[PDB]
Amino acid sequence: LIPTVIERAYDIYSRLLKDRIIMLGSQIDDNVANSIVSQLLFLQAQDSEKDIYLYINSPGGSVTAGFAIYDTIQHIKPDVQTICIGMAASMGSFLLAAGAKGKRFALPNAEVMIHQPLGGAQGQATEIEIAANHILKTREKLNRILSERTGQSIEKIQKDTDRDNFLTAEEAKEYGLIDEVMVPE
Amino acid sequence: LIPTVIETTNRGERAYDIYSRLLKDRIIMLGSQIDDNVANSIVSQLLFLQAQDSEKDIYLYINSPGGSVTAGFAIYDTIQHIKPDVQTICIGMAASMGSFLLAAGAKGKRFALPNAEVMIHQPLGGAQGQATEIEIAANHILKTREKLNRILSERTGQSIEKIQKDTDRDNFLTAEEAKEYGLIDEVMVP
Amino acid sequence: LIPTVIETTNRGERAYDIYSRLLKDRIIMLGSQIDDNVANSIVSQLLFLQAQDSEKDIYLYINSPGGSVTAGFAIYDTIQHIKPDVQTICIGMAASMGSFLLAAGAKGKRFALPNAEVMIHQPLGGAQGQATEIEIAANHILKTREKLNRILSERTGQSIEKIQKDTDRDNFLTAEEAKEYGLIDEVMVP
Amino acid sequence: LIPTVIERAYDIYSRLLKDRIIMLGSQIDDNVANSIVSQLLFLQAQDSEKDIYLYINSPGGSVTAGFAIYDTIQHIKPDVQTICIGMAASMGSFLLAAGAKGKRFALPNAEVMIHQPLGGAQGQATEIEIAANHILKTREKLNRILSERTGQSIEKIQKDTDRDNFLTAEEAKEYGLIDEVMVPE
Amino acid sequence: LIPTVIETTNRGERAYDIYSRLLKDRIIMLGSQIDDNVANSIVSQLLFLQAQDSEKDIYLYINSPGGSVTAGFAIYDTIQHIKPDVQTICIGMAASMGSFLLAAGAKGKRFALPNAEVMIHQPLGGAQGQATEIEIAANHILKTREKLNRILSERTGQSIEKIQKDTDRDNFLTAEEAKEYGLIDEVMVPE
Amino acid sequence: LIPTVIEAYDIYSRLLKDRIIMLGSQIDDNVANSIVSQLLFLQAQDSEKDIYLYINSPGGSVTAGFAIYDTIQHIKPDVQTICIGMAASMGSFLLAAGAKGKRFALPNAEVMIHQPLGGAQGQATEIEIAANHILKTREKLNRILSERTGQSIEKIQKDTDRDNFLTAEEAKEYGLIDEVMVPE
Amino acid sequence: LIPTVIETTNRGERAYDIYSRLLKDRIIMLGSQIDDNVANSIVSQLLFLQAQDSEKDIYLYINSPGGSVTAGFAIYDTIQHIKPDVQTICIGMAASMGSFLLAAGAKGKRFALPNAEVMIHQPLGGAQGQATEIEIAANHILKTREKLNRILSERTGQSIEKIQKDTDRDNFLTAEEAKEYGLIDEVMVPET
Amino acid sequence: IPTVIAYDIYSRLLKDRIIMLGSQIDDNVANSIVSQLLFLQAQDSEKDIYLYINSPGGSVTAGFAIYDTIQHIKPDVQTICIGMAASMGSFLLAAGAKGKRFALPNAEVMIHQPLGGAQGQATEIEIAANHILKTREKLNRILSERTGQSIEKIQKDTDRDNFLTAEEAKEYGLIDEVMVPE
Amino acid sequence: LIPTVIEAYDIYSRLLKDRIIMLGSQIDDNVANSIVSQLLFLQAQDSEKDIYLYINSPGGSVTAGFAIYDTIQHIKPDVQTICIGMAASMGSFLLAAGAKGKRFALPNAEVMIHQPLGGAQGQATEIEIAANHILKTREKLNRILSERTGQSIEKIQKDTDRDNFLTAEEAKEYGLIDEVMVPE
Ligand SMILES: CC[C@H](C)[C@H]1C(=O)N(Cc2cccc3ccccc23)C[C@@H]2N(C(=O)NCCCC(F)(F)F)CCC(=O)N12
Ligand SMILES: CC[C@H](C)[C@H]1C(=O)N(Cc2cccc3ccccc23)C[C@@H]2N(C(=O)NCCCC(F)(F)F)CCC(=O)N12
Ligand SMILES: CC[C@H](C)[C@H]1C(=O)N(Cc2cccc3ccccc23)C[C@@H]2N(C(=O)NCCCC(F)(F)F)CCC(=O)N12
Ligand SMILES: CC[C@H](C)[C@H]1C(=O)N(Cc2cccc3ccccc23)C[C@@H]2N(C(=O)NCCCC(F)(F)F)CCC(=O)N12
Ligand SMILES: CC[C@H](C)[C@H]1C(=O)N(Cc2cccc3ccccc23)C[C@@H]2N(C(=O)NCCCC(F)(F)F)CCC(=O)N12
Ligand SMILES: CC[C@H](C)[C@H]1C(=O)N(Cc2cccc3ccccc23)C[C@@H]2N(C(=O)NCCCC(F)(F)F)CCC(=O)N12
Ligand SMILES: CC[C@H](C)[C@H]1C(=O)N(Cc2cccc3ccccc23)C[C@@H]2N(C(=O)NCCCC(F)(F)F)CCC(=O)N12
Ligand SMILES: CC[C@H](C)[C@H]1C(=O)N(Cc2cccc3ccccc23)C[C@@H]2N(C(=O)NCCCC(F)(F)F)CCC(=O)N12
Ligand SMILES: CC[C@H](C)[C@H]1C(=O)N(Cc2cccc3ccccc23)C[C@@H]2N(C(=O)NCCCC(F)(F)F)CCC(=O)N12
Ligand SMILES: [Mg+2]
Ligand SMILES: [Mg+2]
Ligand SMILES: [Mg+2]
Ligand SMILES: [Mg+2]
Ligand SMILES: [Mg+2]
Ligand SMILES: [Mg+2]
Ligand SMILES: [Mg+2]
Ligand SMILES: [Mg+2]
């Protein structure tokens, strides 16, 4: 049950969108990506100069869906701020790190997790090889961009994402995944 | 079936579902298990209410068995970030992350009704796979408990040691006991 | 399929689902098993009706087999907190936490229709795990029963000892027997 | 798919309710009872003197839910006519018999069935005893009211409801469950 | 996996599964939930043993949560019918119809080991359908309870009223408490 | 789920107002019918202005894909194609089907090409019919892909034998798209 | 698939499944979760062994995660009732009621092999229904715990209080730690 | 299972002191193998026993039942890997009498860290984590002793699934020799 | 229902008395353990007389197959292989592993060769380990098949890329068997 606000009637999320706030509040799949991409394109058309605010409370999900959002963020004119509230894990933390430089935030008790991509492969040896080569290339792609966005080496990113790596908001700032911990007003 | 209320309000007539009507008077309902959807909604409502009026109190109704710790912390951090005081009112039950959020309301403005139940306990989780994966999961949930216990100590005035001991198992408190503990400030009487 | 009713005003025809139409005249329907969703809705309706008119009676219709004790206490405490008298009217059945809420209506304004069924019994629950966990769960449900019995004693005029004995097993009462017991004040005749 | 009628757009059932017609067209549960009770209360408030029409096409259902409807019918001022179309069985036929005296009808090919209440009990001997005593008292309550409404003895009602007893509309009139078979006009 | 024991006898070597070996020595194992299969087996063993020797004691081991009342009464009536004394020995647990059968052993020869658990409670059942069917089922289980209580009164020396009250809910007894109650005669102490 | 914008439109309907169609899911008949209807509507609205087909899709039904393909080729306006996230299978086929010079992908978008998938069960002659059908369908797909990319049918056959993942730049090199759309 | 062993006797050639062969030399295998079937079998074997020889030691092998408390007490009481000493030997694991039985072996004849795992914890159970039914179930499991702890105190030399504290949660012990605790007498070291 | 004349084939092999570990290791398998070892010892305390290993591993405690019984008894227990030894299976392969641990040339040996699970309260998860970590240390220490490799190296090499050929297993010290065709 | 013969033997045990082993099912560890035990037993009984391995099998576990393979090569006696019905996958591998000159198939027996099948799930590095493992296993299989057939590793790789069904005569031509056993 999503509440409605009247001032024109808006569901609460649509009301936030009126003030250029986009909610990434779920597992990332193609539906979520298509919606966020559409919202980004709409907000750019509305105003190419004003900041956009991407709220992130997400365990991650599809890498290609994540890259749909990533590429649209980088394509458009306006700065897209990222703010981690609750959790950003996996492709969620990747998108957190993808916000406009100097405008990537987390609230003090927000959790950030980084790890290597997950997948599956079944069938013939050559099919397994193709799937393995694909996920390994995808991992190099992710690591390269994360290196660029954080200032950490690809070597360090590889090592630090080998297993689940949980970071506090302050640790995420130290790592270069965010720029600042947003403290209470 | 959520009922609708219709008001003839000077500039015309407006129809509200009952929860949206409560939101018009700065009342947010945390009335279910805490997951990311619930957290996203409450966070959005908090941000909206601050924008509407940065000074007037917000009222967070809590009837919840708790749920996701990270989802709970989304709500917690948004409460602490915004300018307005967020009152918390426990009606029915606040358990687990629900009682954590009850304790997170503005100092002096945390309430429970007389027969409301408050329960505190340690976080729950799971881990499967390799020994090193189990270790990572264990270290994570232990650090999460320390985080929770530290904040609860700050909010209640109880020591971290006492919080640890009192949350080892399920600990059910009456509204009055929750006040004594420092989880709330007052039992709201008729 | 819930029917819609349309009433013609000067600024248009206002359309109501039948339950929302009843709410316009301060009638709240407790017509299902009591869970947190039902409790949150009823609590919200009570708060809304008080704000709308702090003096006029509210009418709580009860056709319910009961359900969650904490959800029931959410409704109970909200009834006792608000200014207006909340009349209770049992139609069909009030069982368990449903009969508790029937007995919780404003003194002199608790009713049942002549063929309505009222049932009282002890709380139901479950516990699994370690011996100390079972002990905690047992102590909790026993304390919950004491609370329920104490309040029922206050509301009915019966002794706690009698309430304990009469709720040991399922105890079915006619409307007239419920009046004799003190669970209601009057059998509403045609 | 329930059709809409425009004169005020109404779903067909809401349109019938505008002319004081209530549809009991399903198995009787608490939801159905709450709705019918609310409709009865609303119609009384609208006009305390004009007849209400209760359409009955129902296999019956919950006895307590049925008694919610029954007591509300008897409580309110207006006469509630009952009209059996298709079938009235069990608590459905009980409610058919509960309509205003002289205003209980069935169409010629409508089926009326009467039988004893159904239930269940599991657990300890004393629990089974409580459940048995409860359903037996419920049966006595039903039979007593049916006797009053039909003019048949409690003894006869007991015997005739021991097993499933199917009646034609004409037989239901003879029995005293209805007053008239509504013939074509 | 039930182990086998092999003995050299006078007429050759003989192989027994462990339970069949115990039966050779007039020991019957009631070691499971009581259903008709269990009852038929125990009844057959009792009849066989009685034929083997109408005089020598039989030993009924009881580690059972109870079960079917009629199946229990098959065992009960066969015990009472046959000539030999049937000793009863509770090891682990006797609950419900299991404790009834424990109490049904030969007077003076009903035992429990010190940490054995004895539980008594009222019969359990179910009924669904028409009101008159529910009435028949209720009357049946109530009459069955009386029958059980009457016999338990006779075997324990407790009043029917006390039995009724003490079996209203689950009533767990230690071996010593079961002796005090009259369900057994002695707590068998270590030799 | 889907936010509303007021200037009231759901976000996707708002994009459709500016001639943007979203192919953002697995391709089935429902998706195809919707996209076909949108294409026909946009042509009727303006026969000369470009249409923009967003593609984030793992592919799906070949016949549903061909419903979209044929409608694109039938209508007057140029249909630009833009791969964002992923285009796989029939999704990449449709990406390659956009107006010549107006097929794009964003830099980190993934393009995958492979042979059609299917099933057959029953009698030997039924299996033969199903096999002949899917083989003819593959030839149809390969022929069109050859025409659209400039690659030989022989090369297409070889390169689609197994799953073949391409970067946006590789897709441009292959002739599946015309340009990698760089940040503005 | 349980293998068979054949030994040639004087009055013929005799075949045993491997477990039955071990039983011939007074070895009983508690090698599974403890339920009533397992208890009934072990009780029968103990009675049989006692009858066969009231004086020679019996060897109870324990590789078990535990299980039913009442089934465990069937085995426990039979061990204490019979004449012969019952040695206990933990190989692999003894947990819960399994450890309880390990500790119940003849004094001085309770063993574990060096890498065997011993676990102690409080009893587990369930209860559902009316408040008074839950109370009865709670009182029952609590009394059962007290019974277990009292006997464990007697068998180990540890106080009931220490046992209560050390069984509050899962407590894993090495064979050497189990000896130190008093659950066993000796760690059986490899032979010459 | 075929019969030879009467013995089932496995019981016939047991007559010549051959024990088959040919399945996933659970308590039933461990109890059987332990019983066979004890029996063979009683039959002859001096003659070698032959433990065939074609197993994906399984329960660590069940594996240790077999391990401790092997080390307790007098006779040397040869180990022979045929097909596969993985996990606790390779642990037992390495546990055979020194100089008498073998694999056939195409046999596969796999080593990795123990697997497990934990659910419930934070303190319960901590207990479970500490338990599996201790268990890993126990396994690694013994493997170090049996192979001559350092505990540090074992830890590194078992972090993920590590597949070895028979020759590589010999090089590692898990076996002594690759048994070549007669 | 396996019939009994009295001269008492179940039919398969009777065949084993004459040094005939039946590989008549999917290859798993149980099947491998049984066949290994039978091979060891027979050798003990007579180190010089031929053993006959009947193969009617769709294949199965590669490691289980290698248990049988290595035991065949280890023991002294020649192990003849005879394909009746079908030998597929690891089944055809074992058919090819029989004593040189003593590998047979009946005229209508079917022989199928293909690459190994498997699965992998989890982290990228776990998928890599699983991929490297199955690829090394394939190389091992291909190398041995090359040695046993006289075909090049390159040809084996190409011919096992997909399911490759061969007649008994084609299997002889390939070098998987030595002779097609004709009616006597
Ligand atoms: C030159 C601008 C972009 C690059 C170009 C174009 O490539 N696409 C394809 C496209 C489709 C969908 C998502 C995309 C995300 C990133 C990049 C391209 C995307 C649509 C866009 N349009 C708008 O934005 N129109 C303004 C209204 C927008 C609103 F959302 F409000 F409808 C239509 C006019 C047009 O030329 N382009
Ligand atoms: C107080 C947050 C700061 C000032 C900042 C910013 O960080 N975020 C990111 C954000 C996104 C989502 C949830 C957040 C919760 C806590 C903190 C930040 C959150 C959006 C916010 N905006 C509004 O609130 N705009 C007024 C309209 C608000 C309404 F809800 F009504 F739409 C847009 C203008 C802006 O600078 N910020
Ligand atoms: C009468 C003072 C109550 C005690 C106080 C307060 O504690 N709460 C928290 C609360 C939240 C939810 C349910 C509650 C039930 C019982 C008691 C408190 C409850 C909300 C309430 N508000 C209203 O009722 N506003 C009038 C409009 C109400 C309407 F429903 F129409 F929106 C907001 C202003 C306020 O100070 N309080
Ligand atoms: C003297 C009328 C009854 C006795 C009395 C009262 O007891 N109840 C409780 C009640 C609640 C629900 C169902 C009931 C069925 C039968 C009897 C009582 C029922 C509500 C009713 N109300 C209306 O009918 N108001 C007119 C508007 C009604 C409309 F439906 F249109 F909203 C509110 C004013 C009031 O005093 N009472
Ligand atoms: C005391 C039983 C009476 C005298 C009688 C008789 O009623 N029944 C029926 C019967 C059947 C089954 C169970 C019974 C249990 C209790 C009572 C009767 C039962 C069989 C019995 N027989 C034996 O016991 N024969 C000796 C051999 C017995 C052995 F078990 F070893 F086979 C056959 C000769 C005979 O007259 N009766
Ligand atoms: C393309 C037009 C063709 C030649 C012709 C015709 O074949 N079809 C069948 C048809 C049906 C459905 C999808 C189709 C897709 C591609 C081709 C044909 C399709 C309908 C169309 N109409 C419109 O487009 N009318 C303008 C309004 C359109 C709007 F979408 F806005 F409603 C009706 C007048 C008419 O002659 N034709
Ligand atoms: C020490 C047991 C006492 C003396 C006594 C007795 O109480 N029970 C009941 C009983 C039944 C089942 C399990 C029991 C476990 C512990 C204690 C008693 C148990 C049977 C036993 N019998 C034997 O052991 N007979 C020797 C043969 C034994 C063999 F196993 F081989 F068959 C029959 C002769 C007898 O008097 N008693
Ligand atoms: C002094 C030897 C050992 C130390 C001692 C003892 O501790 N156990 C317990 C035990 C039980 C089960 C498995 C065990 C594995 C390893 C170590 C001990 C095990 C049984 C053993 N017995 C035999 O082996 N008897 C010879 C016959 C054996 C045969 F298998 F054939 F039955 C019984 C005589 C006895 O003193 N012991
Ligand atoms: C040629 C294997 C050598 C000589 C050696 C040895 O390594 N193993 C281990 C082993 C175990 C299981 C399967 C094996 C398969 C291939 C190779 C070794 C295998 C057992 C064998 N034995 C026999 O064969 N004994 C004769 C009786 C045989 C019979 F089957 F009939 F029981 C025991 C005496 C012995 O030294 N070895
Ligand atoms: Mg940007
Ligand atoms: Mg605040
Ligand atoms: Mg009030
Ligand atoms: Mg009336
Ligand atoms: Mg007798
Ligand atoms: Mg003893
Ligand atoms: Mg040794
Ligand atoms: Mg050979």
Author numbering:
A (entry chain C), D (entry chain G): 3 to 9, 16 to 193
B (entry chain B), C (entry chain A): 3 to 192
E (entry chain I): 3 to 193
F (entry chain D), I (entry chain M): 3 to 9, 17 to 193
G (entry chain H): 3 to 194
H (entry chain N): 4 to 8, 17 to 193
The authors write:
Incorporation with the isoleucine fragment and 4,4,4-trifluorobutyl motif into the core scaffold of ICG-001 provided a potent ClpP activator ZG180. ZG180 is more potent than ICG-001 in activating SaClpP for α-casein hydrolysis, as evidenced by a 3-fold decrease in EC50. However, ZG180 also promotes HsClpP for α-casein hydrolysis, which indicates that ZG180 is also a global activator for both bacterial and mitochondrial ClpP proteins. Either ZG180/SaClpP or ZG180/HsClpP structure is a single tetradecamer composed of two stacked heptameric rings. Like the previously characterized ClpP activators, the binding of fourteen ZG180 molecules induces an open-gated state in the tetradecameric ClpP cylinders with an enlarged axis entrance pore. The apparent electron densities in the 2fo-fc and fo-fc omit maps unambiguously demonstrate ZG180 binding on the apical surface of SaClpP and HsClpP. The naphthyl motif and trifluorobutyl chain in ZG180 form hydrophobic stacking in the binding pockets of SaClpP, which contributes to the enhanced interactions. A network of hydrogen bonds between ZG180 and the side chains of D27, L49, Q52, Y61, and Q89 collectively increase the binding affinity to SaClpP. While SaClpP and HsClpP share a high similarity in the primary sequences, there is a large indole motif of W146 in HsClpP but a much smaller isopropyl side chain of I91 in SaClpP in the conserved position. Indeed, structural superimposition of the ZG180/SaClpP and ZG180/HsClpP complexes also reveals that the α-carbon of the naphthyl motif in ZG180 is likely to be a discriminant site for introducing steric clash against the bulky side chain of W146 in HsClpP.
